[PDB]
Design a protein around this ligand. Structure first.
Ligand SMILES: CN(C)[C@@H]1C(O)=C(C(N)=O)C(=O)[C@@]2(O)C(O)=C3C(=O)c4c(O)cccc4[C@@](C)(O)[C@H]3C[C@@H]12
Ligand SMILES: [K+]
Ligand SMILES: [K+]
Ligand SMILES: [K+]
Ligand SMILES: [K+]
Ligand SMILES: [K+]
Ligand SMILES: [K+]
Ligand SMILES: [K+]
Ligand SMILES: [K+]
Ligand SMILES: [K+]
Ligand SMILES: [K+]
Ligand SMILES: [K+]
Ligand SMILES: [K+]
Ligand SMILES: [K+]
Ligand SMILES: [K+]
Ligand SMILES: [K+]
Ligand SMILES: [K+]
Ligand SMILES: [K+]
Ligand SMILES: [K+]
Ligand SMILES: [K+]
Ligand SMILES: [K+]
Ligand SMILES: [Mg+2]
Ligand SMILES: [Mg+2]
Ligand SMILES: [Mg+2]
Ligand SMILES: [Mg+2]
Ligand SMILES: [Mg+2]
Ligand SMILES: [Mg+2]
Ligand SMILES: [Mg+2]
Ligand SMILES: [Mg+2]
Ligand SMILES: [Mg+2]
Ligand SMILES: [Mg+2]
Ligand SMILES: [Mg+2]
Ligand SMILES: [Mg+2]
Ligand SMILES: [Mg+2]
Ligand SMILES: [Mg+2]
Ligand SMILES: [Mg+2]
Ligand SMILES: [Mg+2]
Ligand SMILES: [Mg+2]
Ligand SMILES: [Mg+2]
Ligand SMILES: [Mg+2]
Ligand SMILES: [Mg+2]
Ligand SMILES: [Mg+2]
Ligand SMILES: [Mg+2]
Ligand SMILES: [Mg+2]
Ligand SMILES: [Mg+2]
Ligand SMILES: [Mg+2]
Ligand SMILES: [Mg+2]
Ligand SMILES: [Mg+2]
Ligand SMILES: [Mg+2]
Ligand SMILES: [Mg+2]
Ligand SMILES: [Mg+2]
Ligand SMILES: [Mg+2]
Ligand SMILES: [Mg+2]
Ligand SMILES: [Mg+2]
Ligand SMILES: [Mg+2]
Ligand SMILES: [Mg+2]
Ligand SMILES: [Mg+2]
Ligand SMILES: [Mg+2]
Ligand SMILES: [Mg+2]
Ligand SMILES: [Mg+2]
Ligand SMILES: [Mg+2]
Ligand SMILES: [Mg+2]
Ligand SMILES: [Mg+2]
Ligand SMILES: [Mg+2]
Ligand SMILES: [Mg+2]
Ligand SMILES: [Mg+2]
Ligand SMILES: [Mg+2]
Ligand SMILES: [Mg+2]
Ligand SMILES: [Mg+2]
Ligand SMILES: [Mg+2]
Ligand SMILES: [Mg+2]
Ligand SMILES: [Mg+2]
Ligand SMILES: [Mg+2]
Ligand SMILES: [Mg+2]
Ligand SMILES: [Mg+2]
Ligand SMILES: [Mg+2]
Lengths: 114, 129
RNA sequence: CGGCCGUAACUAUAACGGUCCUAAGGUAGCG
RNA sequence: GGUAGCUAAUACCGCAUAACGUCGCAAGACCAAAGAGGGCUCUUGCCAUCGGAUGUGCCCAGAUGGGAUUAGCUAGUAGGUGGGGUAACGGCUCACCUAGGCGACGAUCCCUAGCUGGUCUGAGAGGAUGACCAGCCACACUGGAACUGAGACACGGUCCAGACUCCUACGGGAGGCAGCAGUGGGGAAUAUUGCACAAUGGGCGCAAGCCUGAUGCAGCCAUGCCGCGUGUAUGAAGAAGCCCUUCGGGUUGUAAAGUACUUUCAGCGGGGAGGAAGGGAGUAAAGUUAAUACCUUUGCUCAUUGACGUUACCCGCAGAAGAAGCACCGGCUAACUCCGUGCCAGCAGCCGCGGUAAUACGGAGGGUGCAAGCGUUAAUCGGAAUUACUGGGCGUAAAGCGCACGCAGGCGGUUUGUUAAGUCAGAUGUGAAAUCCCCGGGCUCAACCUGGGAACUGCAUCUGAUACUGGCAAGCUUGAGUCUCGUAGAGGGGGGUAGAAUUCCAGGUGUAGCGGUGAAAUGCGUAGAGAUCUGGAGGAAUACCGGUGGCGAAGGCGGCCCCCUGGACGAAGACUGACGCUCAGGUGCGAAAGCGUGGGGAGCAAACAGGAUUAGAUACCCUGGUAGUCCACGCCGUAAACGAUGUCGACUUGGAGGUUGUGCGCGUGGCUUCCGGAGCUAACGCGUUAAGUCGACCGCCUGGGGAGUACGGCCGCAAGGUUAAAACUCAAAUGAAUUGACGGGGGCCCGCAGUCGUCAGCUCGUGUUGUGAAAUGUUGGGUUAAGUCCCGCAACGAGCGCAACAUGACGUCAACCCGGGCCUUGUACACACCGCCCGUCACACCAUGGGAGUGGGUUGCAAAAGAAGUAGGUAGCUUAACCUUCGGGAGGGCGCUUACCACUUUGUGAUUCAUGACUGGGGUGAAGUCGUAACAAGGUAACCGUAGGGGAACCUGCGGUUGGAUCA
């Protein structure tokens, strides 16, 4: 572009609303299949946030305690093999329990020190 | 149309050197002669001469050292589409001082070194190395 | 300016297929 | 609150005085004040005027977000004159006059937003940001208003209205934490209803002092930064217990224990700065003074002032005692093993990991990194030259408008003079302090605090410089243009005409077939076709010439003749004198299809019909055939409108052609084609007709999709065109080239045509070529059963195969037909054609368009409304100060009234957000249904525009493109 042209004319987590976490209520809790090449029953949940956005959130770790009308804290973080799953649930915050019988990376799964 | 005779002079030199021409000729002007004088004095060209009166032609004798052309680079800086002027403290160093910038000052066309010693800024015509 | 029956990896429906017959089986649009 | 009476002043009001004050040209006229305190004197206050200082009001220029899918906006509007108004200039206001003013240098409208010093990031230029600290602004429950005052249209003042909420005897009243603390609520999330005025500052006061949620401090919180601790030394028994192990051992690990010690910090007990300056007492002298008085100042001495606070800090006591976690260990990335699990459970920033020997999941052992923190999420800059000013691109990756003319704008050949706007130099003023940076200083160090400097890249003014750019003046001829003579040309528009052929019609001759295909059939024909001859009608196109030929801006243009007309080129001068280049917006031209009206209609041919083909065949093939193709006029405005290459100018080795001028075989112009050098390019390639080297200006790109789609605007008769998003979704999509494999590609050969296969292949070293994957050798000309051999050759040699003396190369299969070899070519294949892959349909989920409408926000316009306030007026009522002839008067107040105006009301638009039966496509999701459109000649070359048709991919017509294979 020429100088004269430039003179004339110069040169993933939206539901958080630039907050580190948002609280929400589980409107559905289910499993879903990952895309190829993966195979599992991945534990997700639809969540209506305190700002009115409804989003799918991932429930990480081995075994969870969430129903419909469970109150959870979500954070950012997509799940690569579930298209349109852009958030993770924080384990050991609010209703969502710590992962049972974890001993490594305990602080990532809300598990108090044995 | 022809809108920058100085860029044309620099290009004639650049292309002349790349083609191993002994000399290059062009339509003369007072500013072209002033620049040719700086190139001669700094030892980039061997000689120049103006011939004519109504239509004067400037001839520049190019110089080669060990086969290689001596003017290894020559680039227009200030140009009609974007004029470039520098204060004395902001005068450019070409090739860490080993090259020259040709500067038009209120005391005539001279090298950046001569401008800096005279305490003058001016228009940066071209870089030569 | 048509019937009949079947058919999709949850069901449901049938883009599809078969079969019969017609001069031709109602298109676009609308309901 | 009301009534009546009473009283004071530094409250209030005349009078006097009245000029370096106000008004006035002057003469003149006119305007003020307050006392109090200590012992006549001192101190302090009061009034006037002119200054200072400080603060504040006002004006101008530049700078300071986004949107044109906002282009016109404005009637006190723009200016003038006069009156009024203000502290003050001013449409500030009003009357009159003029018709202005603003706007593509973005007005108006819409959206977002407190601004700055700075802050974060960055090498810088930038980008992001404006919390804390400091400057400025604005606001104080919401809307409005003034009053008081030096100052307010006033956070803890007044009045009114409104929405809330609370007290009430129901008549009325009351309130405003966006001060500090605190409560509820919202939220992922942010603290005590603390102590003190001791210090600094502020108000009042002569002072003492009083007030001060400013401030100084304390509380809470790892929120950050910085410092310190959680022991130190020894210590092989290499103890157990771990864990791993080829059972040798290894490692944790000198780790632990044990044994010497140490005691910071925490706890407990004793000592002890500094933040205190001052203020209060009588005394000391001097200065005021009637005075050795009071007062003032300075000394003089004696008591005394700390919220923090059980302060900092110091000393002593006891004993390792009270004090280590978090993440990570597949690559990127520092750190590896075993066990459990078995595409599950789960992990994941990206690539990926997990289907029975998982360094990737989960645990353990070991290890790595950080450490009172560590991780995760969010957010900004960086890396990202990935918006490129510094600092990028556009032949094929995304990207040159289809082509031109041209206004604004940008840019401008050459010489002299002048100017001094840009530019440059110097000086002066300013650029707050803090911050950053440098050299120092102070807290034990550090963080932190702090002295001076540097910096603040800027802005303004003044004085100079004059090369370059600009302005002005005068030129110049080289760019650009005019003229003269001539040349070639399917350049354009209009009209005429010729010959060949097809079809049709009429007639003759003639007789059983014709036509068509891969083969058929439909069709035509004994009602005489087809064939052949003669005559006639009509339309459309112009064989040969004909050419990588010519002309045109592009689209395009082809018989011959005439008429009108545009451009190009050459020769030799003459002429004008920069008149130029580019061009957003604008305007024009613009293939084919299509559209409108009127004609025309031979041939051809979308649609359509029938016949075939096929599993089907809405196709390809056949027989027909309507629009259309043709003409006139108007519209459309698009094409692979392509050289996928914008226009103009300059420069830079060669070779071979074509075409068209021209000067003397030899020159010299124009246009054009092929090859190739340097150089350039990712490569392919381009290469004086550049994609090389430069300059001017324009257009355009910013991952693939969603989408050239939606919405809005504009245009169109319509078809549609043009401008042009977002949500959402993926980690790729893409270009060129390489090795294979494959082809219903080409060439040349072979075989009765465990495995491929006894097929003649498969490789390596070194050299050389290529940025590289790779290539060469091994290809080529011959010849052979044979990579057999010969000859050539950037290759030179060698190995395993062949051969020679049954023998199975390197490897493959996680064992005309068929098979195979060599060269070449296309490829979207690499799980390598048993490949890849397209669309409808079906299912699930996600975002989204349209949509009768439905509910809010904001806002334009036109009116209504009129609380309080201020101003104007004033029949009524009323009255402290002044005047009075004592009756009253002046002036005031109240009430009333008018003007302006908030709440609010009504009607009608605009815009935006939310939502909506139903409806449209879009995206995502191992293995669904229907076909097979594309990739090979993909089995009908593909694709572009357009039109019609069809379950779907698509098919068919017309024109266009090569980004098509084939030719032996
Ligand atoms: C704010 N700004 C002016 C935006 C803009 O720059 C646009 C553009 N093409 O550059 C718009 O189209 C923009 O102007 C514009 O028009 C927008 C839209 O029309 C819509 C519509 O209609 C519906 C959904 C989303 C949008 C949108 C997000 O794309 C709008 C963006 C607009
Ligand atoms: K997997
Ligand atoms: K006004
Ligand atoms: K006026
Ligand atoms: K800034
Ligand atoms: K307000
Ligand atoms: K006052
Ligand atoms: K105080
Ligand atoms: K640039
Ligand atoms: K000048
Ligand atoms: K122009
Ligand atoms: K027809
Ligand atoms: K290459
Ligand atoms: K352009
Ligand atoms: K995207
Ligand atoms: K080699
Ligand atoms: K082949
Ligand atoms: K919908
Ligand atoms: K709506
Ligand atoms: K096809
Ligand atoms: K077509
Ligand atoms: Mg008074
Ligand atoms: Mg008086
Ligand atoms: Mg936009
Ligand atoms: Mg829009
Ligand atoms: Mg006036
Ligand atoms: Mg004004
Ligand atoms: Mg705001
Ligand atoms: Mg950078
Ligand atoms: Mg602020
Ligand atoms: Mg800003
Ligand atoms: Mg006042
Ligand atoms: Mg107040
Ligand atoms: Mg308050
Ligand atoms: Mg508060
Ligand atoms: Mg809450
Ligand atoms: Mg008080
Ligand atoms: Mg490593
Ligand atoms: Mg295992
Ligand atoms: Mg981040
Ligand atoms: Mg950048
Ligand atoms: Mg790029
Ligand atoms: Mg392409
Ligand atoms: Mg492209
Ligand atoms: Mg073009
Ligand atoms: Mg032009
Ligand atoms: Mg010039
Ligand atoms: Mg100047
Ligand atoms: Mg400063
Ligand atoms: Mg000049
Ligand atoms: Mg002509
Ligand atoms: Mg005509
Ligand atoms: Mg046509
Ligand atoms: Mg027509
Ligand atoms: Mg036909
Ligand atoms: Mg046909
Ligand atoms: Mg186009
Ligand atoms: Mg064309
Ligand atoms: Mg072409
Ligand atoms: Mg194009
Ligand atoms: Mg031409
Ligand atoms: Mg070439
Ligand atoms: Mg469109
Ligand atoms: Mg549109
Ligand atoms: Mg071979
Ligand atoms: Mg051999
Ligand atoms: Mg050979
Ligand atoms: Mg043998
Ligand atoms: Mg062979
Ligand atoms: Mg809707
Ligand atoms: Mg009123
Ligand atoms: Mg096909
Ligand atoms: Mg095909
Ligand atoms: Mg093809
Ligand atoms: Mg199109
Ligand atoms: Mg068809």
């Amino acid at each position: 572009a020429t100088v004269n042209q430039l003179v004339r004319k110069p040169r993933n987590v939206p539901a958080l609303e630039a907050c580190p976490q948002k609280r929400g209520v589980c409107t559905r809790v289910y499993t879903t299949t990952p895309k190829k090449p993966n195979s599992a029953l991945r534990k997700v949940c639809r969540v209506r946030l305190t700002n009115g956005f409804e989003v799918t959130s991932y429930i990480g770790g081995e075994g969870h305690n969430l129903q419909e009308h469970s109150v959870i804290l979500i954070r950012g973080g997509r799940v690569k093999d579930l298209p349109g799953v852009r958030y993770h649930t924080v384990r050991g915050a609010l209703d969502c329990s710590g992962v049972k019988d974890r001993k490594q990376a305990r602080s990532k799964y809300g598990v108090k020190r044995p | 149309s022809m809108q920058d005779p100085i860029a044309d002079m620099l290009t004639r030199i650049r292309n002349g050197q790349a083609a191993n021409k002994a000399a290059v000729t062009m339509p003369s002007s007072k500013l072209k002669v002033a620049i040719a004088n700086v190139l001669k004095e700094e030892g980039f060209i061997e000689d120049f001469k103006v011939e004519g009166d109504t239509k004067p032609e400037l001839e520049l004798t190019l110089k080669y050292f060990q086969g290689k052309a001596v003017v290894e680079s020559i680039q227009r800086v200030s140009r009609p589409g974007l004029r470039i002027y520098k204060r004395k403290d902001e005068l450019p160093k070409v090739m860490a001082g080993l090259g020259i910038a040709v500067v038009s000052t209120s005391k005539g066309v001279m090298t950046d070194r001569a401008a800096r010693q005279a305490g003058l800024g001016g228009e940066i015509i071209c870089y030569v190395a």
